Amino acid sequence: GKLNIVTTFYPVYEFTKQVAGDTANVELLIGAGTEPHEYEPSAKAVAKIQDADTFVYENENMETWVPKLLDTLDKKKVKTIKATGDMLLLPGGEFDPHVWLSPVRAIKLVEHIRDSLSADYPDKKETFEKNAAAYIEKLQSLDKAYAEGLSQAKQKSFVTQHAAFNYLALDYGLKQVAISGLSPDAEPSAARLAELTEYVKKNKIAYIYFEENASQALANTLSKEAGVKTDVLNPLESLTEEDTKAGENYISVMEKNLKALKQTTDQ
Ligand SMILES: [Zn+2]
């Protein structure tokens, strides 16, 4: 019947479902409201993976538990796919795994998933290739929107609370500045607030981007004390249940990210 495929977190799920389409029941292991950077599967989740037909993960530098799991899998039926393949990676903040925030790299991940599924299930190669080709067409339009909207950036540097955008920066000619010690929910101390205010002023920072909407308390404090606005650059590591309700997907969230980023890069 239908292939049973287990994927780790949202972009791996989305790219795999786009390629597999109706040939497969694609399960999302790390769902909405859980952090993929900290997740590790329980024994029952591990058993689910081992008896799947296919398991897709993004990269061992993201799902750092996958290397230990791979050693058990030769006595198990599941065939595995590393979505990033042999893509070379940037150094970590020990390599940076966040390649899917660059549309041109997302195309490469889709192509690799297509080719791996095609090699594992030759009788479905026609379907994998036609599903992948239609989605890659959509990713190419996203890539063009990014290239057109960011290539003439007057302001090349952008400040983010989650450092997921180094490949976006590399591939589209920008500079990610990561800031730690802020959470979308935090109320920073007076001393922390003063550090941010000095940085914001001496570098003319217009926005701080968060992985989800800053709390109304944090946004008001940053405006009144630091003179900086806030917005969202979503690393697409897990959709909120809100976003899942509204039908957001990789491309729509990437379009929202572009719009938010241009508030900085267009000056
Ligand atoms: Zn991340």
Q: CA-to-CA distance for 93 and 178, rounded, in angstroms?
A: 9
Mark the residues whose beta carbon lies below 5 A from ion ligand 1.
Answer: 164, 235
14 Cα–ligand 1 center, Å: 17
Please indicate if the annotation marks 112 as binding a ligand.
no
Hey, what long-range contacts does 175-181 have (CB within 8 A, 24 or more apart)? 178/93, 179/208
Q: CA-to-CA distance for 100 and 185, rounded, in angstroms?
A: 25
How, if at all, do strands 175-178 and 3-7 pair? unpaired
Q: CA-to-CA distance for 76 and 92, rounded, in angstroms?
A: 32
Q: CA-to-CA distance for 221 and 79, rounded, in angstroms?
A: 50
Whole-Å CA distances, 232 to 43, 159, 191, 214: 35, 11, 24, 8
Query: Quick one: resolution in A?
Result: 2.0
The DSSP symbol for 215 reads P
75 Cα–ligand 1 center, Å: 32
* Nearest 10 degrees: Cα torsion 112, 129, 255, 93: 0
Place of tokens 């190669």: 125
Beta strands in the chain (DSSP E): 3-7, 24-28, 54-57, 79-82, 157-160, 175-178, 207-210, 229-232
**Solved using:** X-ray
How, if at all, do strands 207-210 and 229-232 pair? parallel
Instruction: Tell me if 207 sits within 8 A of 226, measured CB to CB.
Output: no
Residue whose C-alpha is closest to residue 210's, from 248, 165, 241: 165
Instruction: Give the angle subtended at the CA of 120 by the CAs of 143 and 37, to the nearest 5°.
Output: 55
**In which region does residue 173 sit, left (phi positive, over 0), alpha (psi from -120 to 50) or beta (all else)?**
left
The DSSP symbol for 73 reads G
199 Cα–ligand 1 center, Å: 23
Count CB neighbours of 265 within 10 A: 21
23 Cα–ligand 1 center, Å: 30
Please list, in sequence order, all residues whose beta carbon lies within 8 angstroms of the beta carbon of residue 172, skipping any fewer than 6 positions away: 102, 146, 147, 150, 151
What is the number of residues in the chain?
267
The DSSP symbol for 214 reads P
125 Cα–ligand 1 center, Å: 32
Instruction: Tell me if 248 sits within 8 A of 135, measured CB to CB.
Output: no
Instruction: Tell me if 19 sits within 8 A of 117, measured CB to CB.
Output: yes
164 Cα–ligand 1 center, Å: 5
Please indicate if the annotation marks 37 as binding a ligand.
yes
Instruction: Give the angle subtended at the CA of 15 by the CAs of 144 and 31, to the nearest 5°.
Output: 120
Please indicate if the annotation marks 162 as binding a ligand.
yes
Please list, in sequence order, all residues whose beta carbon lies within 8 angstroms of the beta carbon of residue 214, skipping any fewer than 6 positions away: 184, 185, 222, 230
CA 237 to chain centre: 5
Hey, what long-range contacts does 129-138 have (CB within 8 A, 24 or more apart)? 131/18, 131/19, 131/20, 131/21, 132/18, 132/19, 135/15, 135/18, 135/19, 135/110, 136/107, 136/110, 136/111, 138/251
In 3-state terms the chain splits into helix, strand, coil percentages (rounded to 5) of 50, 15, 35
